[PDB]
């Protein structure tokens, strides 16, 4: 593998892809990187709202499983046959790999129009893998057939393309220090959140209301989605931080938009480091939260039904190492999350952790 | 799912082995397979890939010509025919899917 190859080598509001090479003769289909789930899936028929498919009848390695895979959720679905096939990724590697892969024919408003990309690549664990967890993920596949080390790391430059490294840490992409909280749990990239903190001032709030369901980092995720109590929390700190006459309540949550940066408050997230008695905070400035649609703006954070999610908005400021090897997620301050020569996200510690709870995920 | 592996030993330069590994606790017949060898003080190394219906195989150019992979979905068990070996070679040979592996089998060559 060649880590200075892939830099760059992600496209990117609507989600950061990665060209890869599929079959025999090889396919060119690019395949939105998501961390929060652990399938390889991608667009098998001829569908609205997309460029291009893969063709499973014009490869002659591809092989059927014989079965097919369905995903159900609220707002709604997708259904694909399972097979193997041999892929290459240009930008990285010049040889091919195995891989298990969904080859989707069927869905409910999965391929949305205006899309560039017409799959997804699941970097999650194998507890997530659909049918079951013994459905070899991709960078398991990858791991094991290419002599790389257990470690992706992913850089969004949007705010600012983006850069996939697997197999480690490419330099030339940050400046400063690396701070590692640990892997609570491996199924999505479960971290612990200490404390949220708005403008200097700290949400009145216990730190398992941070954890309720579950804390993860997830590139699929367009925004920062907290819990409706924390949501609350986070958008009433917002207001009165805020100097300027009161945003509108749709605003808020995202009915309409704000048209017209000193005057809105920073966003840091406590982040528990390897050592248990320190933290470090991972920051946001108004730029990355108050998002680009006179200038109309969007509220980059929403509420959300279960878990608390560190999305794209929060990742856009910041070089996101995903250290499966040692079990942890690595955080440092993106060069490229930068607007009109200011930077968009800070990193900093550590902080004592001597005021709260051990364990901040409920159990 | 559980992996255990046989068939290793201590062998001349120019010899022979036949590696075996048991499947268990999984649907083996559609499992992607591959085996990966690991000597003291050196990197990881991928040896051979095999899909679930034994078709498609792979290798690396280090034993291209050399070892073949197979397959019997019907009795749970991997293979590895490794023919013409040398001290290079020498390795604990393992087997792994979906992120798990077996504890592996010593092949040793030497004069
Ligand atoms: C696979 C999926 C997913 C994500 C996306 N992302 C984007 O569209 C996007 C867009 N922009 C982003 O960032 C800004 F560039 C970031 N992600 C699409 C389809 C999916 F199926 N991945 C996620 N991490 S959560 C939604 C989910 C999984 C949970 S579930 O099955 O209930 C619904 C599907
Ligand atoms: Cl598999």
């Known amino acids: ?363 | 799912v559980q992996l255990q592996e046989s068939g290793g030993g201590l062998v001349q330069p120019g010899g022979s082995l036949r590696l075996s590994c048991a499947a268990s606790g999984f649907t083996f017949s559609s499992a992607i397979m591959t085996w990966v060898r690991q000597a003291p003080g050196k990197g990881r190394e991928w040896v051979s890939t095999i899909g679930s219906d034994g078709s498609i195989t792979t290798y690396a150019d280090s034993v291209k010509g050399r070892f073949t992979i197979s397959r019997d979905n019907a009795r749970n068990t991997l293979y590895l025919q490794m023919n013409s070996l040398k001290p290079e070679d020498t390795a604990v040979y393992y087997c792994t899917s979906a992120g798990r592996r077996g504890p592996g089998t010593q092949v040793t060559v030497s004069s």
């Open chain 1, 1 to 363: 593998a060649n880590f200075l190859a892939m830099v760059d080598n992600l496209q990117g509001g609507r989600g950061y892809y990665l060209e890869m090479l599929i079959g025999t003769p090889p396919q060119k289909l690019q395949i939105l990187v998501d961390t929060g789930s652990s399938n390889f899936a991608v667009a098998g028929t001829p569908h609205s709202y997309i460029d291009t498919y893969f063709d499973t009848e014009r490869s002659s390695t591809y092989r059927s499983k014989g079965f097919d895979v369905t995903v159900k959720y609220t707002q709604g679905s997708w259904t694909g046959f399972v097979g193997e096939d041999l892929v290459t990724i240009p930008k990285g590697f010049n040889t091919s790999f195995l891989v298990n892969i969904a080859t989707i024919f069927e869905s409910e408003n999965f391929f949305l129009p205006g899309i560039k990309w017409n799959g997804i690549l699941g970097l999650a664990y194998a507890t997530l893998a659909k049918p079951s967890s013994s459905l070899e993920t991709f960078f398991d596949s990858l791991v094991t057939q290419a002599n790389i080390p257990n470690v992706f790391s992913m850089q969004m430059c949007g705010a600012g393309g983006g850069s996939l490294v697997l197999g480690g840490i490419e330099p030339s992409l940050y400046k400063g220090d690396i701070w590692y909280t640990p892997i609570k749990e491996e199924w999505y990239y479960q971290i612990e959140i200490l404390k949220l903190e708005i403008g200097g001032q700290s949400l009145n709030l216990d730190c398992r209301e941070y954890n309720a369901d579950k804390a993860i980092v997830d590139s699929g995720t367009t925004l920062l989605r907290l819990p409706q109590k924390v949501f609350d929390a986070v958008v009433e700190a917002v207001a009165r931080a805020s100097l300027i006459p009161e945003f509108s309540d749709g605003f808020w949550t995202g009915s309409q938009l704000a048209c017209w940066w000193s005057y809105f408050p920073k966003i840091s997230i406590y982040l528990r480091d390897e050592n248990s008695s320190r933290s470090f905070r991972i920051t946001i400035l108004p730029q990355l939260y108050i998002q680009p649609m006179y200038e109309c703006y969007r509220f980059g954070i929403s509420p959300s039904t279960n878990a608390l999610v560190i999305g794209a908005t929060v990742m856009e400021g910041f070089y996101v190492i995903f250290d499966r090897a040692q079990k942890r997620v690595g955080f440092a301050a993106s060069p490229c999350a930068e607007i009109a020569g200011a930077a968009v996200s800070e990193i900093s510690g550590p902080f004592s952790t001597e005021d709260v709870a051990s364990n901040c995920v409920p159990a």
